[PDB]
Amino acid sequence: DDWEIPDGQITVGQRIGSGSFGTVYKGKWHGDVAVKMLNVTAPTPQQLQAFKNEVGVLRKTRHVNILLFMGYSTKPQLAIVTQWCEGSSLYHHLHIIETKFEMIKLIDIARQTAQGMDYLHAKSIIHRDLKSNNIFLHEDLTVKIGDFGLATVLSGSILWMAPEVIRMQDKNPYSFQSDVYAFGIVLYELMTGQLPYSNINNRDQIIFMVGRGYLSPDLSKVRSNCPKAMKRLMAECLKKKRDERPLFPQILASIELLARSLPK
Ligand SMILES: O/N=C1\CCc2cc(-c3cn(C4CCNCC4)nc3-c3ccncc3)ccc21
C-alpha cells in the first residue's frame, strides 16, 4: 500500500524548473510524471522535514483539482512524484505566452481552483502559497493545484500574500482566510490578464504599502465583460481585514452561480 518507489524505477529527464525546496524534472514512472527533488549531497534536517511534511499532506489528497501524488523516493535523493501535466501553469499562460482565454474559460479556471481550495480546507489543509505558478492547466481544460512543500494541517512570493501575512504580525498570519486572499489575486490575474501593481517598479515599495494597507489591487482593470458578481467576489476575497473574507464554500457557490447566468 505504501507509496515509496524502489530506487532505479523513476527515470529523470528534463530539468524544467523550481518548486518549494527543490528542482522539478519531467520524468518517467508508469508513464510521464513530474518529479521534484529536494536534494543533493545529503539532506539537511531542514529538507528532510520539508519532504516529510509534503508527502504527508499529499497523501491526504485525492481530487481532480489537486495535482495527483503518485509516490516518493528517498534513495537516490529525496524525490516526490506526481502526474505530469501537459500544458503549463496558469502563470505561464497569463504572463509569459499571453494566452488569451475567453471569459467563460477564465470563470471555469476560477471555479475549479475554487473547487480544489474548497476540498483542501474541508480537510484542514492550508496551502500557504496559492499563486498562478502553482495552478497547472492539465490538457488545457482541467485545473490541478500543485506544490505542497509549504502546506500545513532566500525566498518570497508576496504578490499573492495577504497584508496580515506580509507584516508577520504573530506566529500565525496563515489561515483559510490568507489562502482566500491569494485566490483573490489569482481572480485578479484571470480577469485583468495582469499581475497586480504593475505600475510600481519597486518590490519593497509594494511589500510595505500592502502591509500598511496603502496599496491594493486596482479593480478598475478588470476586463469589461467580467460579470459584476465576479468583480464583487474578487473584492470580498481581497478584503484587508481577513475576518471579512468569505470562506471557500461561499466562494464556490458564488462562482457556480455567476457561471449559470453567464453563457448569456
Ligand atoms: O511539491 N511540488 C511539486 C511536486 C511535483 C511538482 C511539479 C511542479 C512543476 C513546476 N513547473 C515550473 C517550474 C519553474 N519553471 C516553470 C515550470 N512546472 C511543474 C509541473 C508539475 C506537474 N506537471 C507538469 C509540470 C511544481 C511543483 C511540484
Side-chain angles (χ1 to χ4, degrees), residues 77-98:
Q77 292 146 85
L78 298 191
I80 304 186
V81 174
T82 70
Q83 89 195 106
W84 172 260
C85 295
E86 198 45 42
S88 197
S89 56
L90 189 52
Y91 184 88
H92 190 255
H93 282 280
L94 258 19
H95 308 312
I96 305 307
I97 69 207
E98 321 216 53

Side-chain angles (χ1 to χ4, degrees), residues 94-95 103 106 185-198 217-224 226 234:
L94 258 19
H95 308 312
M103 185 56 44
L106 301 169
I185 290 295
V186 352
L187 288 178
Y188 177 90
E189 300 178 78
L190 300 171
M191 299 304 108
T192 72
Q194 215 155 349
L195 286 174
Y197 316 140
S198 57
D218 182 359
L219 303 191
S220 287
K221 296 172 56 69
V222 302
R223 95 179 47 170
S224 39
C226 183
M234 196 173 328

Side-chain angles (χ1 to χ4, degrees), residues 176-190:
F176 295 160
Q177 265 85 4
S178 58
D179 269 356
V180 171
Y181 184 86
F183 180 79
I185 290 295
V186 352
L187 288 178
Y188 177 90
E189 300 178 78
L190 300 171

Side-chain angles (χ1 to χ4, degrees), residues 202-253:
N202 186 270
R203 196 171 109 112
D204 165 86
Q205 294 301 319
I206 297 169
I207 56 152
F208 174 60
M209 301 180 93
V210 170
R212 301 269 271 241
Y214 306 157
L215 214 220
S216 68
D218 182 359
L219 303 191
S220 287
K221 296 172 56 69
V222 302
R223 95 179 47 170
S224 39
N225 59 164
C226 183
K228 291 279 76 49
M230 178 61 81
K231 197 178 183 137
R232 188 174 321 123
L233 171 76
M234 196 173 328
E236 292 315 321
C237 283
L238 287 181
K239 291 298 199 173
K240 314 214 161 82
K241 288 176 204 167
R242 68 186 192 177
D243 296 338
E244 305 176 7
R245 291 169 205 160
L247 298 188
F248 267 106
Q250 206 198 303
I251 298 172
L252 195 47

Side-chain angles (χ1 to χ4, degrees), residues 30-80:
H30 293 298
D32 289 332
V33 289
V35 193
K36 191 177 67 165
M37 265 157 130
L38 295 255
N39 72 257
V40 273
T41 62
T44 309
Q46 174 67 1
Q47 321 183 268
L48 223 312
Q49 204 11 56
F51 162 94
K52 271 320 179 177
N53 164 75
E54 179 177 9
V55 169
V57 174
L58 276 175
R59 51 145 79 200
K60 283 165 105 284
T61 66
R62 291 179 157 264
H63 182 287
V64 292
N65 290 124
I66 305 312
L67 185 78
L68 170 72
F69 169 66
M70 277 179 164
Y72 64 85
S73 193
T74 52
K75 274 163 42 252
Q77 292 146 85
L78 298 191
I80 304 186

